[PDB]
Structures are given as structure tokens and as C-alpha cells.
Amino acid sequence: AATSRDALPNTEASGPTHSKEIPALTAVETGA
Amino acid sequence: AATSRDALPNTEASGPTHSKEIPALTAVETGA
Amino acid sequence: EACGYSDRVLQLTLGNSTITTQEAANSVVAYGRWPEYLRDSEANPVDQPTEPDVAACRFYTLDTVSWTKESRGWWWKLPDALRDMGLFGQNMYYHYLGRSGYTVHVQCNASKFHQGALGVFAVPEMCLAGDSNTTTMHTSYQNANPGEKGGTFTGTFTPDNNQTSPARRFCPVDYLLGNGTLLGNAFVFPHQIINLRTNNCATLVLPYVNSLSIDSMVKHNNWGIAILPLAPLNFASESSPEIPITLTIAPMCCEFNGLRNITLPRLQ
Amino acid sequence: GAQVSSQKVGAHENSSTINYTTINYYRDSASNAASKQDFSQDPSKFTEPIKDVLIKTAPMLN
Amino acid sequence: GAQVSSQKVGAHENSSTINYTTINYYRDSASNAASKQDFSQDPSKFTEPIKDVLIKTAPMLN
Amino acid sequence: GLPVMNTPGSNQYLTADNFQSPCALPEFDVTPPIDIPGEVKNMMELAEIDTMIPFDLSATKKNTMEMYRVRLSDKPHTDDPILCLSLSPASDPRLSHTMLGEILNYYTHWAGSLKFTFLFCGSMMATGKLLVSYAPPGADPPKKRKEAMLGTHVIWDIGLQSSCTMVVPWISNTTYRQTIDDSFTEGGYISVFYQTRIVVPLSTPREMDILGFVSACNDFSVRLLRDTTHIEQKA
Amino acid sequence: GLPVMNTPGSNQYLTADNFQSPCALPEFDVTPPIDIPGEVKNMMELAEIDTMIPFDLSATKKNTMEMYRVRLSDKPHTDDPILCLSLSPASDPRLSHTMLGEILNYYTHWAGSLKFTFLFCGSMMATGKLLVSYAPPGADPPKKRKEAMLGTHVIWDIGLQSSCTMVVPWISNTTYRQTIDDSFTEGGYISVFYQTRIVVPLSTPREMDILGFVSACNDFSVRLLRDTTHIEQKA
Amino acid sequence: FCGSMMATGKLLVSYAPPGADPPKKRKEAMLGTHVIWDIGLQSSCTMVVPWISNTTYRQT
Amino acid sequence: GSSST
Amino acid sequence: GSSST
Ligand SMILES: *C(=O)CCCCCCCCCCCCC
Ligand SMILES: *C(=O)CCCCCCCCCCCCC
Numbered sequence: 001a002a003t004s005r006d007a008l009p010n011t012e013a014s015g016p017t018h019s020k021e022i023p024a025l026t027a028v029e030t031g032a
Numbered sequence: 033a034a035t036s037r038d039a040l041p042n043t044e045a046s047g048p049t050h051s052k053e054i055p056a057l058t059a060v061e062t063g064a
Numbered sequence: 065e066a067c068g069y070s071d072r073v074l075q076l077t078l079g080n081s082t083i084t085t086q087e088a089a090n091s092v093v094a095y096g097r098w099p100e101y102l103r104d105s106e107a108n109p110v111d112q113p114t115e116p117d118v119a120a121c122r123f124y125t126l127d128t129v130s131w132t133k134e135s136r137g138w139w140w141k142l143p144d145a146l147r148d149m150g151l152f153g154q155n156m157y158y159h160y161l162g163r164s165g166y167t168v169h170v171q172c173n174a175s176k177f178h179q180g181a182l183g184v185f186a187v188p189e190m191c192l193a194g195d196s197n198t199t200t201m202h203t204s205y206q207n208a209n210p211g212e213k214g215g216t217f218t219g220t221f222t223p224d225n226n227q228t229s230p231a232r233r234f235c236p237v238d239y240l241l242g243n244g245t246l247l248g249n250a251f252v253f254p255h256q257i258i259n260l261r262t263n264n265c266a267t268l269v270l271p272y273v274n275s276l277s278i279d280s281m282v283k284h285n286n287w288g289i290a291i292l293p294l295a296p297l298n299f300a301s302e303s304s305p306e307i308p309i310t311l312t313i314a315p316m317c318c319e320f321n322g323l324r325n326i327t328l329p330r331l332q
Numbered sequence: 333g334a335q336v337s338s339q340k341v342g343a344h345e346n347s348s349t350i351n352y353t354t355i356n357y358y359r360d361s362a363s364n365a366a367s368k369q370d371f372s373q374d375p376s377k378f379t380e381p382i383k384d385v386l387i388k389t390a391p392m393l394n
Numbered sequence: 395g396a397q398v399s400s401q402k403v404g405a406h407e408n409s410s411t412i413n414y415t416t417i418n419y420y421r422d423s424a425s426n427a428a429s430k431q432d433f434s435q436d437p438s439k440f441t442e443p444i445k446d447v448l449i450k451t452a453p454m455l456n
Numbered sequence: 457g458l459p460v461m462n463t464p465g466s467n468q469y470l471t472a473d474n475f476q477s478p479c480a481l482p483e484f485d486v487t488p489p490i491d492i493p494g495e496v497k498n499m500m501e502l503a504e505i506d507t508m509i510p511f512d513l514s515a516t517k518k519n520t521m522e523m524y525r526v527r528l529s530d531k532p533h534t535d536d537p538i539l540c541l542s543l544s545p546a547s548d549p550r551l552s553h554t555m556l557g558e559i560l561n562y563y564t565h566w567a568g569s570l571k572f573t574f575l576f577c578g579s580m581m582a583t584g585k586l587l588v589s590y591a592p593p594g595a596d597p598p599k600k601r602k603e604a605m606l607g608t609h610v611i612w613d614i615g616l617q618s619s620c621t622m623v624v625p626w627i628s629n630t631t632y633r634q635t636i637d638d639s640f641t642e643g644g645y646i647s648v649f650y651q652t653r654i655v656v657p658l659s660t661p662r663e664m665d666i667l668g669f670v671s672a673c674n675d676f677s678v679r680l681l682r683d684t685t686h687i688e689q690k691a
Numbered sequence: 692g693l694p695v696m697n698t699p700g701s702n703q704y705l706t707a708d709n710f711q712s713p714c715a716l717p718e719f720d721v722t723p724p725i726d727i728p729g730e731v732k733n734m735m736e737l738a739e740i741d742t743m744i745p746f747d748l749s750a751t752k753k754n755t756m757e758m759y760r761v762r763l764s765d766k767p768h769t770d771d772p773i774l775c776l777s778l779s780p781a782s783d784p785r786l787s788h789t790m791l792g793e794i795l796n797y798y799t800h801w802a803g804s805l806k807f808t809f810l811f812c813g814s815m816m817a818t819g820k821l822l823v824s825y826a827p828p829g830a831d832p833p834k835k836r837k838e839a840m841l842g843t844h845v846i847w848d849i850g851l852q853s854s855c856t857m858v859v860p861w862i863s864n865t866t867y868r869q870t871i872d873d874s875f876t877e878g879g880y881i882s883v884f885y886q887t888r889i890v891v892p893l894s895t896p897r898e899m900d901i902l903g904f905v906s907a908c909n910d911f912s913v914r915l916l917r918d919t920t921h922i923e924q925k926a
Numbered sequence: 927f928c929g930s931m932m933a934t935g936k937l938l939v940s941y942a943p944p945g946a947d948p949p950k951k952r953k954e955a956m957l958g959t960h961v962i963w964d965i966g967l968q969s970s971c972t973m974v975v976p977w978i979s980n981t982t983y984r985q986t
Numbered sequence: 987g988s989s990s991t
Numbered sequence: 992g993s994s995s996t
Contacts, residue, residue, distance in 0.1 A: 024963075060506065096439035176816050251743060261814055325591065325596065326595060352419065353419070373501070
């Protein structure tokens with residue numbers, strides 16, 4: 001149902017972080 | 033009912049002003 | 065977590081800055097208190113505070129030092145180390161009063177064939193001893209405040225004998241934590257150990273600590289960071305090994321009172 | 333005839349109102365100690381002795 | 395205004411809680427004796443100041 | 457009789473003590489009070505009354521009526537100070553003898569907000585805008601309007617309301633400041649400047665005086681009673 | 692007035708007494724507390740914090756950073772001790788100056804269980820098994836692994852968990868031990884041994900340090916407050 | 927990072943929005959948007975350059 | 987008896 | 992009167 005002329009996603013407000021979640025780290029070897 | 037050892041008044045938060053109220057201006061001639 | 069999460073792998077994000085680590089040994093929150101802003105019930109200056117938020121509460125990286133077999137130790141004072149750091153420093157010098165907490169992240173990586181252990185200590189009110197046996201409490205403000213550069217510990221107390229032009233500086237002997245108390249007990253202070261076989265880093269979250277709710281950041285340092293080699297650096301068989309130690313610090317929940325013209329200190 | 337009153341407690345021990353007890357031993361009030369249970373008043377009779385009540389946001393003279 | 399409290403009784407006579415009585419004579423708390431009725435706290439803020447709660451049977455590092 | 461045991465402090469005389477003692481004139485018929493006007497309940501009531509500042513304690517004006525007058529004139533705009541004052545209410549020579557300063561010298565510690573009111577005593581035909589400033593401590597004391605501008609300030613326009621009040625807000629690190637000159641508890645700087653200039657027409661005096669007053673705001677308190685240095689008795 | 696009778700003890704000054712006394716500054720406006728981080732309620736909280744032991748107080752290593760480092764090496768298995776220590780927490784030179792030892796020197800009597808934690812500061816490539824022992828008092832102090840084996844012990848395998856803790860259980864005849872060297876209240880012997888040996892590969896340092904820490908278990912208490920010999924003032 | 931498993935290191939990846947001196951030293955780069963990448967089992971690190979522009983669209 | 991306050 | 996504890 002996503003039309004070509006639909007608006008792209010909104011930027012959500014984000015605060016400080018001190019976590020075990022690591023989005024910045026990855027492994028491109030996987031192919032992704 | 034104000035006791036000597038009662039605490040003095042709290043400072044209330046105050047914002048910007050653009051008004052016809054003039055607290056800063058006065059006339060000491062009055063005696064006050 | 066069965067879905068991969070670990071105490072060794074962390075991501076910290078403050079403002080426009082992110083730190084990653086894959087070899088951490090958890091992190092310490094000093095005295096169990098996370099940094100907070102000054103509450104109305106504990107407030108004292110009545111003027112509206114300046115709170116710079118992301119412009120100052122972000123990660124500043126100070127100059128990298130070098131760990132060798134000769135290294136006796138290093139020290140820094142807060143807020144002093146950060147006095148020239150971007151908009152934090154500017155806000156610090158334009159206001160009479162300021163308070164701040166900090167995230168301290170000490171960085172030191174090496175290899176599975178290196179050895180050594182750094183003790184990283186956060187000391188509230190780290191008053192250090194001076195170089196004189198003839199006069200006391202006489203270290204100059206300039207010498208007491210090295211800024212980003214920090215200072216070092218010595219293995220030997222060597223008294224300033226120049227009575228006519230006194231050096232007026234600290235002489236911090238390492239096993240006495242530069243203050244007359246024994247280093248083995250410094251572990252009652254908030255700390256972590258970078259033991260090279262275990263971790264690349266130390267992370268300490270520091271609350272604002274003082275006997276006042278807010279104070280002069282220019283006249284007074286609240287915290288001292290002391291880094292000392294508990295176990296000396298060693299590698300394979302090389303007589304003179306070296307590995308870098310990088311220090312990155314973020315102000316947290318900082319607010320400032322008493323705005324006026326900028327303070328221009330005599331730092332030399 | 334004992335009089336029991338609250339202490340305004342400043343520095344607290346690591347240890348609820350604390351009280352103290354007073355008994356007057358003499359017939360003459362002059363012999364009595366100072367209660368220190370005193371009142372405060374508004375400074376107006378000195379700071380604002382003007383016949384027409386002032387409003388601080390308004391012009392003092394009009 | 396008398397305060398009555400329990401004594402922790404150590405060596406007992408060949409003789410049920412034993413009490414002692416306290417009355418404050420002065421208006422200022424500073425004049426008061428030391429209660430000694432103090433509290434104890436958990437050493438955690440010093441012994442375990444780590445962000446992620448430790449389980450002693452589990453590997454400290456994982 | 458009742459078994460008693462003497463504690464330390466026994467038989468001493470503390471001049472600040474508060475005990476009962478025998479009356480030397482029993483059953484004396486005391487004269488009742490009447491309702492005298494002007495009763496005071498607390499010394500701080502007096503500190504809240506505006507009192508005039510001896511601003512000009514220059515060698516020839518001090519201890520004369522002249523010390524109270526700050527002279528202004530219709531001269532061209534300058535950025536130099538009309539007056540400069542350290543916020544040391546009990547110890548600065550210009551504040552220490554005001555009613556506020558005098559009560560403060562009977563106590564060791566003060567806290568709270570202060571207010572300075574200036575009265576223009578020039579002719580009605582005279583106009584002008586002035587800048588009244590307060591700089592909290594820690595930087596170079598303001599010697600030019602450009603630095604004073606950056607702190608707490610009021611721009612006073614002279615007109616029918618003759619007087620203007622600047623409030624010096626309680627901005628301190630410590631909970632209480634000392635009643636002596638001490639850098640650890642220093643309060644900052646008050647300075648006055650010409651924003652534009654005083655303008656008079658012809659046939660008008662080109663020089664005039666302003667008078668200044670200080671008093672305490674309702675959040676002001678003092679503590680630790682002490683003896684003053686402002687009175688003495690040699691022999 | 693009321694018939695009273697003075698008992699012994701009257702007018703004495705016991706420095707450990709607990710009495711009311713007149714306040715010299717009545718009605719003083721006290722500054723309220725703020726919530727300062729790090730409050731302590733009992734000295735034993737501090738004794739429960741791990742502190743580093745100066746194990747090697749040899750003539751050239753004492754009073755230097757070196758006294759804290761116990762050197763190990765990849766040498767062949769021996770049954771001889773790495774270190775030997777008397778369980779005298781307040782009086783043995785290696786324990787007496789630790790935070791635990793220091794608090795213990797302000798008291799006459801101690802009781803409870805202790806724990807010793809060792810940290811291996813060698814490379815990740817280094818492996819090894821060590822035996823940490825505690826022998827209760829009364830026999831020959833262990834000088835060989837064979838005797839140490841027979842008492843309370845932990846066999847520590849070096850690996851990702853860098854550190855190992857041996858608990859010294861409260862095993863005493865008396866309810867409390869003294870804070871001085873005294874045979875009647877002697878606590879026994881701590882000794883460390885190589886179970887197998889430290890093994891390194893090539894290109895790896897063959898010598899490394901271990902560090903040791905001591906702290907008190909939650910069943911630990913001290914009593915009879917006294918003055919310490921660890922500070923003094925000649926003149 | 928395509929180095930051996932035995933190799934360790936920490937790098938700083940930076941993004942400075944336009945208008946000042948282009949960063950030639952870590953001290954200036956530190957002050958802008960950045961990631962401190964620690965090399966380890968997760969081989970790769972991603973820095974996001976956030977849309978920070980005055981105009982709604984930039985030119986190609 | 988006890989006048990409280 | 993008597994505050995017990
Ligand atoms: C009211 O006071 C009733 C209770 C009295 C309690 C005992 C008082 C202590 C002795 C006071 C003696 C009288 C003083 C001349
Ligand atoms: C509460 O205290 C009510 C009962 C009082 C019992 C008698 C107290 C003994 C005398 C105390 C005198 C007051 C001290 C200034």
C-alpha cells in the first residue's frame with residue numbers, strides 16, 4: 001500500500017544512551 | 033501567626049516581560 | 065541475552081557523539097548516583113540557570129598520553145581538564161557558578177600478548193601534596209590546574225629547595241596517592257581496572273559531588289581522575305614497549321548561574 | 333503543670349518531632365526564662381507608611 | 395514530654411524488657427545528647443557500584 | 457535526699473544561657489503596657505527600610521553632607537563609570553554604615569537579595585538614560601559599559617517617576633556569605649553608567665545630583681550574633 | 692528546695708559521657724542538609740570494600756609501588772610457597788595498613804569471616820592453576836603444598852574470569868580475637884601455591900604479576916573502641 | 927577492518943557540518959558528529975551522517 | 987498535667 | 992506525657 005508519492009518516515013526525537021544495544025557495530029561479511 | 037523561626041518566602045519562577053506594568057520605576061519622595 | 069547481548073559490549077551516545085566498545089568490564093556509577101539537575105528544594109542562586117544541554121553534554125577527547133615501563137601515573141582535575149572544551153568551557157567562564165556531572169571513558173587497547181593493569185580512580189576533592197618542605201599549602205593556581213594536559217605522579221618525593229624563586233607546584237608520590245594516604249586503599253574511591261587481558265577500557269559515571277549545591281568551577285575542582293599502573297606494562301620481550309591511553313570525557317546535566325562578562329584567568 | 337514544646341531540629345543524627353519540657357518554679361513571671369516562641373510582623377508601618385496603599389506594578393505617582 | 399526506650403541488655407543479673415527515660419531540658423536540638431538509636435545501610439554504593447547488577451553465582455564477565 | 461550526680465557545665469556562667477532565677481522584688485505591681493506606635497518584632501524589619509548610601513567617600517567629601525551626593529552632568533556620552541561599588545554590605549565603607557550595614561555588623565553571616573534605588577534630584581527639564589549594573593563575582597570588575605551590559609542590569613529612563621530600583625538577586629555559591637571582606641564569599645560588583653547622556657535645555661543647570669538607597673528584599677536573613685566593630689570604649 | 696544527695700561520679704568528666712549541655716548560640720538558623728552522594732552509616736561498610744594488600748614488604752620493595760606486586764613465572768612445578776601470610780588482620784605488616792587493617796586498629800576486638808581475592812595481571816595467552824590455602828592455627832605452618840592441601844583451600848584456574856576469591860571462614864575458639872599479635876587468639880595461616888604451573892607460548896612474557904585484595908564478609912564485627920598506633924604527634 | 931584477528935585498535939570517524947575550518951587534526955574533528963570505533967569481533971562500524979542542511983534540498 | 991504545644 | 996519506644 002506504499003505509494004511512490006507518499007512522504008518518507010518522520011524523524012523521531014532521540015535522547016542520550018548508555019546501553020548494551022550496539023546499532024553502530026555490525027559485520028558486512030554477512031552480505032547485509 | 034508568622035513565627036520568627038518560620039522559613040522566608042520561596043522564589044517563584046519568572047519568565048520574560050513586555051508590559052505596561054512598571055515595578056522598577058517608583059518615587060521615594062512618597063516616603064515608601 | 066540468548067539473542068547476543070553482553071556486559072563487554074557497549075554503546076554510549078551523548079549529543080552528536082557515540083562511543084562503542086567490544087571489550088568493557090561493565091561500567092561504574094559513582095556512589096550509585098546518576099547525575100541530575102539541581103532540584104528546587106536544594107536550590108540556592110535565584111536566577112534562571114543556563115543549561116547548554118547537547119552543546120556541552122557531549123564527548124570531548126583530551127590529548128592522548130603514552131604508557132611505558134617508566135610510567136608512574138597520570139592525574140587530571142574536573143572541571144579543569146575540560147576548561148577549553150568547546151561550548152562547555154565557554155559557559156563555564158561566562159558564569160560565576162556552575163555544576164556538572166561527568167561520564168569518564170578511559171581507552172587503552174593492546175594485544176593478547178601484552179600485560180599490565182591500570183587502576184582508574186575517581187577521587188572527590190583530590191587535594192594533592194606540594195613540593196615544599198619549608199612552606200605548606202603553597203602550590204600556585206597555574207600549577208594546580210594543568211588543563212587538558214593533566215599532570216603525572218612520581219615515585220620519589222623531591223623537595224623544591226629554591227627558596228628565592230619557589231617552583232610552587234605539586235609533588236605527587238605514587239604509592240601515597242600524591243596526598244599522604246596509601247594507594248592500596250584508593251579502591252574505596254569509585255574505580256575500575258583496565259587489566260589488558262580482560263578489557264580495553266574503563267567507564268565511570270560521576271555525579272556532581274560537593275558540600276554545596278553549586279559552586280565556582282573556576283576556583284574549585286570537584287573530582288580528580290587518577291590513573292596509575294598497578295601492574296607494569298609488559299610485552300613479549302621488548303625492553304621498551306609503549307601503548308597509548310586516550311581519555312574521553314562528557315559533561316552531564318550541567319547548569320550555570322550568575323551570568324556576566326567572561327573570566328580571563330592567568331594560566332601561566 | 334509541665335509545658336511541652338517542639339524543637340526546630342537542625343543537624344539530625346543517623347537516628348518524627350523532637351520535644352523539650354519546661355516547668356516554672358517561681359510565682360513571679362519575671363523569674364521565668366525566655367520562651368523564644370516569638371512572632372514576626374509585616375514591615376509596612378515602616379516600609380510603606382503612606383495613606384494611599386501602593387501597588388508595585390503601577391506608577392507610584394499618578 | 396518524657397521519652398522511654400529499651401536498653402539492649404547484655405550481662406543479666408540473677409534477677410522482660412528493661413527501659414530508660416530521657417527528658418530534653420533545652421530548646422535547641424544541639425543541646426541534646428546522642429540518641430545512639432542509629433540505622434544501618436547496605437554497603438552496595440561502595441562495594442557494588444556497577445551499572446549492571448551482579449549475580450554472585452554467575453560469571454562476572456559475560 | 458534524691459540521689460543526684462553533677463555533670464560538666466555545673467556552676468558555669470554561659471552569658472547566652474536561658475534559665476529561671478529568683479525574683480528580687482516579689483509581688484511588685486507592674487505598670488501595664490499601653491499601645492505605643494512603632495513596635496518592632498525583628499531586626500530584619502529595619503534592614504528592609506531604604507537608607508541613603510554615602511557613595512562619595514573621597515578625602516574632601518567624606519564625613520560631610522556631600523558624601524551622599526553623586527554628581528552627574530550634561531556632558532557627551534562616555535562609557536566610563538559614574539560609580540563603582542563592591543557588594544560587601546557589611547564591610548565596604550559605602551555600605552557598612554547604612555542601617556542594613558549596621559545590623560549586618562552585629563551578625564557573622566548574611567543571605568538574601570538586596571535592592572538599590574536611585575533618586576534623580578535634577579530639574580524637571582532634565583532628561584537622561586542610565587544603566588545600573590550588577591556583575592556576579594569571578595571575572596574582571598566592569599570598568600566600561602560594554603562589560604557591565606553583560607551582567608544583571610536595569611536601563612533607567614528619567615521622567616515623572618523620579619526613582620528607579622535595581623534588585624541584586626541572591627546569587628551565591630555558599631548558603632550564607634560572611635560579614636567581612638573575604639574572597640571565598642565575595643558578592644560581586646555594582647556599577648552605574650550613562651546609557652545615552654543627561655540632556656538639559658538652555659537656562660537649566662547642567663549639573664545635578666542623584667541619591668542612592670539600599671534595602672533588603674523579603675528573602676534576606678542574618679545569623680550568628682556577634683559584637684560590632686562600629687562602637688568601642690578605650691578606657 | 693528539693694532535698695538532694697550527691698553520689699560518687701559527681702563533677703567528673705568522663706570523655707565517653709552522653710549528657711545535655713547549654714547551647715552557646717541559641718536560635719541560630721542552621722543550613723539544611725542537601726543529598727550528598729556517598730553517605731556512610733557504619734565503619735564496617737568500609738571494611739567490606741576490597742583493598743589491595745602490600746604482600747612484598749621486602750627491604751627493597753617496601754614503601755614503593757612494588758610491594759603490591761606478587762611476581763609469578765612459567766618455571767617448572769614446585770611445591771614451595773608463592774607467598775605466606777599470618778591471619779592477623781590488624782597486626783601483620785601486610786594486612787595492618789589495608790582499609791580493613793586500619794579500621795581494626797581503632798578497635799580492641801574483631802570477629803567474623805574474611806575474603807581474599809586474587810587478580811591475575813598476566814597476558815591472555817598465559818594459563819595456570821594455583822592453590823590458595825587457609826590453615827586454622829595449632830599445627831606447623833604450611834611450607835609445602837602437601838600440608839596446605841589439607842586445610843581450607845581453593846584451586847584457582849586462570850581464564851576469562853580474571854580473579855578468584857577464597858573465603859577465610861570464622862573458625863575461632865574465642866568469640867572475638869584481639870587486634871594485636873597474641874598466641875591465645877591466633878588466627879592461622881594463608882599461603883598460595885602453584886597447583887600445576889604457569890604456561891605461556893613463545894613471544895609471550897614469561898613473568899607476570901598477581902595482585903591481592905582483602906575485605907570483610909557480612910558477618911564481621913569489631914568492638915571496644917581504642918586509639919590507633921598508626922598516627923602520632925611527637926611534640 | 928580487514929586486518930588479522932590478532933590486531934586491535936580504536937578509530938574515530940567524524941562528520942563536521944559546513945562553515946568552519948575543515949578538520950585537519952583529531953582535536954577539531956572530535957567537536958563534531960562522531961563515532962569512536964573499537965575493533966573486535968564485530969568487524970565493521972557504521973557512522974550515520976545526519977541530514978543537517980539549511981536548504982530543503984542540496985544540489986548534485 | 988502536661989500542657990503540650 | 993510519656994512517648995514510649
Ligand atoms: C505540673 O507541673 C504537674 C506535674 C509536676 C511534675 C513534677 C515537677 C518537678 C518538681 C517541680 C517542683 C516545684 C518547683 C518549686
Ligand atoms: C513531659 O515531659 C511531661 C512530664 C514531665 C515530668 C517531669 C519532668 C522533670 C523536670 C523537668 C524540668 C524541665 C527542664 C527545663
